[PDB]
Ligand binder design. Sequence first.
Ligand SMILES: Cc1cn([C@H]2C[C@H](N=[N+]=[N-])[C@@H](COP(=O)(O)O)O2)c(=O)[nH]c1=O
Ligand SMILES: Cc1cn([C@H]2C[C@H](N=[N+]=[N-])[C@@H](COP(=O)(O)O)O2)c(=O)[nH]c1=O
Ligand SMILES: [Cl-]
Ligand SMILES: [Cl-]
Ligand SMILES: [Cl-]
Lengths: 197, 203
Amino acid sequence: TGLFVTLEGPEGAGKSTNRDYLAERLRERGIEVQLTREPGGTPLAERIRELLLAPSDEPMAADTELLLMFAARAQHLAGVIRPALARGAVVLCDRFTDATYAYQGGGRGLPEARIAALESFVQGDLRPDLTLVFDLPVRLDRFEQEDRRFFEAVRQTYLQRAAQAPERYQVLDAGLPLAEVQAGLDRLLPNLLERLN
Amino acid sequence: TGLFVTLEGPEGAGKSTNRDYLAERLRERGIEVQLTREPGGTPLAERIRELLLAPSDEPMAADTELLLMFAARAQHLAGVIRPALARGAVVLCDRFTDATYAYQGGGRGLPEARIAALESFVQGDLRPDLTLVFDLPVEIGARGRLDRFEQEDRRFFEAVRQTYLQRAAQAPERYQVLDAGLPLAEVQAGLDRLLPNLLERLN
Ligand SMILES: Cc1cn([C@H]2C[C@H](N=[N+]=[N-])[C@@H](COP(=O)(O)O)O2)c(=O)[nH]c1=O
Ligand SMILES: Cc1cn([C@H]2C[C@H](N=[N+]=[N-])[C@@H](COP(=O)(O)O)O2)c(=O)[nH]c1=O
Ligand SMILES: [Cl-]
Ligand SMILES: [Cl-]
Ligand SMILES: [Cl-]
């Protein structure tokens, strides 16, 4: 049995360096670590990501964007995430369904219930064991074209979701000195290892 | 007030030769016709189509394939189908959700209940007003499809064929089954025969 950990938050929050940090802590304890990201994580998922990010003169329907995001997820689950967990590996996934509630839900305004329906439809009972929210104040692809209010509603959705399920989430103040943040990651580790074992 | 007509069946069933005939019967009667096809029908929906058709060493999960089909459908609905019906055009759409039940359901073995939930999720209350099923026994009659579906065996395609006939029989009011194996004159007669009912559905 393995463990499914997701990381959510914007760039410049240190997600990658901190994911590397966590990954080294686990690896030095003999635990296999599978790094991955969404949307993407397999050849086909990465091609779907390309459609998602590529600007176009044709407006992408909201449902189209939502269904593509979940198509990439479906493929990623089958190709990478589930097999990793089956190996007893710890998956460190940069962005997952919380990013859907945040971007397609908070950002775009899609009803949370439609996102919930697809989450269950695609994932069955699988949810992350732990979700690390890297929180900090707020050419381009389709999403980077968006405005400050979009990214503000994005930020707030992570915190709202994190607040409703405090046991599954750990919110990190990415505005804190890196050293302090990684100290937080160290304090999370025992519980992580306990979960895994 | 338009009419949403879909055409189902494999390649070499005459769907296109038949669609052109049907489209002209409508046009000569002063009726606007919108030709389209799935997966695809808009630039983004065609990009999705090409992903679905592209061979790869990585197997596409059945759910991935189902979701991409519906993603293309949602874009196509918004950009072509709903507008056309709104203008009061007759949409003649090559392939639609019946192909999903047939390919993803019958072929891939996905449960009909899962397909139905997506159908509703994406389409709301919109379903075809009339579906023409061009029924053809599995007939290989040069390089093949040249796409992902080329690799599937006869059993897969038998299941596809049978799914169409089962759906048509379950709701005879909405489907017309044509024998696409007939000489083209006789298929045209089939089109001629169903035309008056199609017209009555429009007004
Ligand atoms: C996984 C996921 C990502 N996204 C967005 C977040 C990102 N847009 N920004 N900023 C983009 C991912 O690109 P990056 O991983 O390079 O950040 O896709 C969603 O909108 N929904 C999702 O479910
Ligand atoms: C519309 C639709 C098509 N398809 C398949 C049927 C076809 N493969 N074969 N034979 C392919 C459509 O391409 P053609 O119409 O050019 O044949 O996509 C689906 O699997 N699901 C769908 O929902
Ligand atoms: Cl973010
Ligand atoms: Cl990654
Ligand atoms: Cl067409």
